[PDB]
Design a protein around this ligand. Sequence first.
Ligand SMILES: Nc1ncnc2c1ncn2[C@@H]1O[C@H](COP(=O)(O)OP(=O)(O)CP(=O)(O)O)[C@@H](O)[C@H]1O
Length: 205
Amino acid sequence: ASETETFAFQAEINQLLSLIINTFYSNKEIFLRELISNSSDALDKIRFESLTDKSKLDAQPELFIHIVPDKASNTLSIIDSGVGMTKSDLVNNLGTIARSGTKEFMEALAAQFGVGFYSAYLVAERVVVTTKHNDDEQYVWESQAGGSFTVTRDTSGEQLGRGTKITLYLKDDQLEYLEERRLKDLVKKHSEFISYPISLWTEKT
Ligand SMILES: Nc1ncnc2c1ncn2[C@@H]1O[C@H](COP(=O)(O)OP(=O)(O)CP(=O)(O)O)[C@@H](O)[C@H]1O
């Protein structure tokens, strides 16, 4: 049926990506704290609307963050019970939105506070976001950071019912972040100190 609406990137978002990706960072580990942030924020926002209305939390009436390395697909996934996004929050907040502090965060850096979501693309060549808000259906956002992304209505297969799953497809050199030592440490590490619980799940072979 083609629920995919293919869009193109902000001109400045492109710059923002070019900064991140095309600068070798010793520690690209920044990205994880960056994602767990936006997740805490999402759990925080749903926890809020959950006072004014209790029909909200009913979806998954528990607030969690899951981290799944999967060596099959070489992906690292981040999963919360948080607010989620509508097609609008997808097409509007992810791709078309310059996060708070301007790219002059980094633009003046030619001459971390925080990078946010886009920090993901230093360890991954590709990323897919599967999300469920309450007022809207489940949508799927995907980009290779090649100056266009795609948003697709996903009414089929499995639903979270609420919240968001970010799955990043790691670059061939970046697979260290599929490791349990690497990650168990990083759980307990920067942004372990936080409101919600963090489960790391790994496959025993
Ligand atoms: N886990 C999540 N659940 C739902 N929406 C999310 C999300 N992570 C990001 N978003 C949406 O995408 C937007 C833009 O992403 P981005 O990470 O660039 O900014 P941010 O609002 O997370 C602050 P920062 O720049 O510090 O991360 C967010 O404002 C939010 O609307």
